[PDB]
Design a binder for this molecule. Sequence first.
Ligand code: NI
Lengths: 83, 131
Amino acid sequence: LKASISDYTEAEFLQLVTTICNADTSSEEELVKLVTHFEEMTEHPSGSDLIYYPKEGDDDSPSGIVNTVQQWRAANGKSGFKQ
Amino acid sequence: MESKRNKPGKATGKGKPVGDKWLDDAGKDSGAPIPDRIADKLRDKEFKSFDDFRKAVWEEVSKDPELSKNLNPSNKSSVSKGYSPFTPKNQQVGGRKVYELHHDKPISQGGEVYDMDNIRVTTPKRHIDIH
Ligand code: NI
């Protein structure tokens, strides 16, 4: 499921990001915990700003978010999605 | 008694005009006021606990164009459930990543729980620095 981003396929990570974006949770706590997990998986310096306070012109749509993460990891010497 | 916050009460108070930078002020000074527009909607309603009041405030901001315009879509989805919206990373502290409702005169010192003139919106970084 979730130890590091390399345990995620790109589809499954898109699932996680879609859930966060829609706040499709049962409590604020569960949402907070998912967003925390996301940050931990991506390791991106912006943390939860990738989802909530995107840069000017950045696609903050779910697919948009996964691309941004995907391109940053690649460009930063980190492992990518499973497979 | 256990907590004064869990005792039912009616929201009172006027709040204050706010503009496009409202949540930006939550990160400064004593925080941002509850907007006069939210107060007009919640004033006189009875809440069973302060948590309840807090969920009402965030559902109201979700339906308010001025207040909601710019909250990005993912924050709009959160406040539409009545959750507190996320702050920018730099104002988050630890597991505290959303906007917090602070009582300007502490409840433990006699400040009113649901008096919206005693209530401020703050980021976790400012709530702890305002302490
Ligand atoms: Ni406080």
